[PDB]
Design an enzyme around this catalytic site. Structure first.
Site, PDB file in Angstrom:
ATOM      1  N   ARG A  30     -13.210   0.485  -5.185  1.00 12.11           N
ATOM      2  CA  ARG A  30     -11.973   0.380  -4.364  1.00 12.11           C
ATOM      3  C   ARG A  30     -11.706  -1.051  -3.869  1.00 12.11           C
ATOM      4  O   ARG A  30     -10.574  -1.370  -3.620  1.00 12.11           O
ATOM      5  CB  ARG A  30     -11.915   1.383  -3.187  1.00 12.11           C
ATOM      6  CG  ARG A  30     -13.100   1.296  -2.237  1.00 12.11           C
ATOM      7  CD  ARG A  30     -12.940   1.939  -0.845  1.00 12.11           C
ATOM      8  NE  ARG A  30     -14.123   1.536  -0.052  1.00 12.11           N
ATOM      9  CZ  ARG A  30     -15.342   2.072  -0.146  1.00 12.11           C
ATOM     10  NH1 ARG A  30     -15.564   3.119  -0.933  1.00 12.11           N
ATOM     11  NH2 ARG A  30     -16.341   1.570   0.580  1.00 12.11           N
ATOM     12  N   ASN A  31     -12.727  -1.915  -3.815  1.00 17.47           N
ATOM     13  CA  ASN A  31     -12.614  -3.271  -3.356  1.00 17.47           C
ATOM     14  C   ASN A  31     -12.636  -4.313  -4.458  1.00 17.47           C
ATOM     15  O   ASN A  31     -12.924  -5.493  -4.176  1.00 17.47           O
ATOM     16  CB  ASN A  31     -13.783  -3.538  -2.413  1.00 17.47           C
ATOM     17  CG  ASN A  31     -13.570  -2.930  -1.055  1.00 17.47           C
ATOM     18  OD1 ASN A  31     -12.450  -2.539  -0.705  1.00 17.47           O
ATOM     19  ND2 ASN A  31     -14.631  -2.868  -0.264  1.00 17.47           N
ATOM     20  N   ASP A  64     -11.960  -8.040   0.043  1.00 18.51           N
ATOM     21  CA  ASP A  64     -12.700  -7.626   1.259  1.00 18.51           C
ATOM     22  C   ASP A  64     -14.074  -8.331   1.501  1.00 18.51           C
ATOM     23  O   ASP A  64     -14.869  -7.892   2.333  1.00 18.51           O
ATOM     24  CB  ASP A  64     -12.864  -6.094   1.289  1.00 18.51           C
ATOM     25  CG  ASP A  64     -11.687  -5.386   1.916  1.00 18.51           C
ATOM     26  OD1 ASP A  64     -10.523  -5.759   1.657  1.00 18.51           O
ATOM     27  OD2 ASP A  64     -11.948  -4.436   2.683  1.00 18.51           O
ATOM     28  N   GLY A  89       0.942   3.519   3.183  1.00 17.28           N
ATOM     29  CA  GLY A  89       1.526   3.373   4.536  1.00 17.28           C
ATOM     30  C   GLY A  89       1.340   1.992   5.148  1.00 17.28           C
ATOM     31  O   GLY A  89       0.994   1.870   6.322  1.00 17.28           O
ATOM     32  N   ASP A  96     -19.872  -4.490   1.356  1.00 16.22           N
ATOM     33  CA  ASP A  96     -19.145  -3.285   0.991  1.00 16.22           C
ATOM     34  C   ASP A  96     -18.581  -3.361  -0.411  1.00 16.22           C
ATOM     35  O   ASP A  96     -17.426  -3.004  -0.620  1.00 16.22           O
ATOM     36  CB  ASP A  96     -18.045  -2.949   2.013  1.00 16.22           C
ATOM     37  CG  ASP A  96     -17.412  -1.619   1.718  1.00 16.22           C
ATOM     38  OD1 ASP A  96     -18.149  -0.687   1.258  1.00 16.22           O
ATOM     39  OD2 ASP A  96     -16.175  -1.517   1.866  1.00 16.22           O
ATOM     40  N   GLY A 148       0.845  -1.178   0.000  1.00 18.31           N
ATOM     41  CA  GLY A 148       0.000   0.000   0.000  1.00 18.31           C
ATOM     42  C   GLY A 148       0.879   1.226   0.000  1.00 18.31           C
ATOM     43  O   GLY A 148       2.090   1.146  -0.275  1.00 18.31           O
TER      44      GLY A 148
HETATM   45  C1  LIG Z   1      -1.803  -1.224   5.319  1.00 19.55           C
HETATM   46  C2  LIG Z   1      -3.178  -0.692   5.630  1.00 19.55           C
HETATM   47  C3  LIG Z   1      -4.221  -1.543   4.932  1.00 19.55           C
HETATM   48  O1  LIG Z   1      -4.450  -2.679   5.341  1.00 19.55           O
HETATM   49  N1  LIG Z   1      -4.826  -0.994   3.872  1.00 19.55           N
HETATM   50  C4  LIG Z   1      -5.861  -1.690   3.115  1.00 19.55           C
HETATM   51  C5  LIG Z   1      -5.328  -2.548   1.971  1.00 19.55           C
HETATM   52  C6  LIG Z   1      -6.191  -2.862   0.918  1.00 19.55           C
HETATM   53  C7  LIG Z   1      -5.717  -3.661  -0.120  1.00 19.55           C
HETATM   54  C8  LIG Z   1      -4.401  -4.156  -0.158  1.00 19.55           C
HETATM   55  N2  LIG Z   1      -4.060  -4.858  -1.228  1.00 19.55           N
HETATM   56  N3  LIG Z   1      -3.765  -4.204  -2.434  1.00 19.55           N
HETATM   57  C9  LIG Z   1      -3.572  -5.179  -3.328  1.00 19.55           C
HETATM   58  C10 LIG Z   1      -3.185  -5.193  -4.696  1.00 19.55           C
HETATM   59  O2  LIG Z   1      -3.000  -4.121  -5.204  1.00 19.55           O
HETATM   60  N4  LIG Z   1      -3.093  -6.310  -5.412  1.00 19.55           N
HETATM   61  N5  LIG Z   1      -3.354  -7.590  -4.891  1.00 19.55           N
HETATM   62  C11 LIG Z   1      -3.700  -7.664  -3.601  1.00 19.55           C
HETATM   63  N6  LIG Z   1      -3.986  -8.929  -3.058  1.00 19.55           N
HETATM   64  C12 LIG Z   1      -3.834  -6.501  -2.761  1.00 19.55           C
HETATM   65  C13 LIG Z   1      -4.203  -6.156  -1.417  1.00 19.55           C
HETATM   66  C14 LIG Z   1      -4.489  -7.162  -0.426  1.00 19.55           C
HETATM   67  O3  LIG Z   1      -3.450  -7.856   0.096  1.00 19.55           O
HETATM   68  C15 LIG Z   1      -3.995  -8.704   0.976  1.00 19.55           C
HETATM   69  C16 LIG Z   1      -3.304  -9.598   1.765  1.00 19.55           C
HETATM   70  C17 LIG Z   1      -3.997 -10.417   2.629  1.00 19.55           C
HETATM   71  C18 LIG Z   1      -5.375 -10.368   2.721  1.00 19.55           C
HETATM   72  C19 LIG Z   1      -5.996 -11.312   3.686  1.00 19.55           C
HETATM   73  C20 LIG Z   1      -6.148  -9.481   1.962  1.00 19.55           C
HETATM   74  C21 LIG Z   1      -5.477  -8.634   1.087  1.00 19.55           C
HETATM   75  C22 LIG Z   1      -5.818  -7.573   0.088  1.00 19.55           C
HETATM   76  C23 LIG Z   1      -7.223  -7.146  -0.193  1.00 19.55           C
HETATM   77  C24 LIG Z   1      -3.585  -3.799   0.881  1.00 19.55           C
HETATM   78  C25 LIG Z   1      -4.020  -3.039   1.934  1.00 19.55           C
END
Ligand SMILES: */C=C\C(=O)NCc1ccc(-n2nc3c(=O)[nH]nc(N)c3c2-c2oc3ccc(C)cc3c2C)cc1
Length: 275
Positions: free
Chosen positions: A158-159, A172, A33, A154, A31
């Protein structure tokens, strides 16, 4: 405290999912931060073995509470039950034994769908077939999740995440949102598959405004009154009237007169066959 007091945290071994820590190489944050929370990694052998793929990994921040541990376990456990589909972020494995807690998921290289669209706005790349394809794939993913008795709650752009090959993957599912809530969820706190259909309508609108913010210039406080008084968003310029039609059917006040996800899949599939 659980985390405060334990030298080792005895979470149970589930062999369906446990993934060998020596096969996993942690990389840079995933991300802004998000250092120490969600990171990129490379994972070897998943298997078509001795071969590497890029994955995503969640862990507990160095300051995590018992509550953060619970949330992460809960989310891990929900993702165990749901099963696998091409248009969701699939769980790939967990590291729970003999070290820090890792939850490992598919990595979609291009980020979330709002930002994917916004970044590629013209002053084509985001052609009608591309947009419909995004819409169609999100619908299939929801049809799958609904078939697994999972209500998202949700669903928003964004999700939804975008892979290297432009595949949509809903995220999510295992857990300002107000603008995506059906009236019956806003008012009566009831969430159903048909309240997710409402949310899908909003997402459709997001898609066809190339990542626009819903109810522009409307303060979330009045959104409740407005929606009860029958206010609905207007047709995006990038949107043929037949699609705006679907969008509006998703925002029917009566949940039973909103289409189902099966029907949204079929309608959208025809629009692709037409192009
Ligand atoms: C650090 C603060 C925080 O948690 N922010 C929210 C957040 C939302 C999404 C992701 N994230 N971005 C991703 C991406 O661009 N491409 N692929 C994936 N899988 C991405 C995620 C993400 O990484 C994980 C790891 C583990 C779980 C259980 C769920 C997710 C997601 C949705 C990072 C942070």
């Amino acid at each position: 405290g659980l985390l405060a007091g334990l030298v080792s945290l005895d979470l149970p071994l589930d062999p369906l999912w446990e993934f060998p820590r020596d096969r996993l190489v942690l990389g840079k944050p995933l991300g802004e931060g998000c250092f120490g929370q969600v990171v990129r990694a490379e994972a070897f052998g998943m298997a078509r073995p001795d071969q590497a793929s890029t994955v995503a990994v969640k862990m507990l921040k160095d300051n995590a509470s018992d509550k953060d541990l619970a949330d992460l376990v809960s989310e891990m456990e929900v993702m165990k039950l749901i099963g696998r589909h091409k248009n969701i972020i699939n769980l790939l494995g967990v590291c729970t034994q003999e070290g820090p807690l890792y939850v490992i998921v598919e990595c979609a290289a291009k980020g979330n769908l709002r930002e994917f669209l916004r970044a590629r706005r013209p002053p084509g790349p985001l052609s009608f077939p591309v947009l419909v394809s995004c819409a169609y794939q999100v619908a299939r993913g929801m049809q799958y999740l609904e078939s697994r008795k999972c209500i998202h709650r949700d669903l928003a752009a964004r999700n939804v995440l975008v892979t290297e090959d432009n595949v949509m993957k809903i995220a999510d599912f295992g857990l300002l949102p107000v603008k995506w809530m059906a009236p019956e969820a806003l008012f009566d706190e009831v969430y159903t598959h048909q309240s997710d259909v409402w949310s899908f309508g909003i997402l459709l609108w997001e898609i066809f405004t190339l990542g626009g913010s819903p109810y522009p210039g409307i303060p979330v406080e009045e959104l409740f009154s407005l929606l009860r008084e029958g206010h609905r968003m207007d047709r995006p310029p990038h949107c043929p009237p037949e699609l705006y039609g679907l969008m509006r059917e998703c925002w029917h006040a009566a949940p039973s007169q909103r289409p189902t996800f099966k029907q949204l899949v079929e309608a959208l599939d025809k629009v692709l066959l037409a192009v």
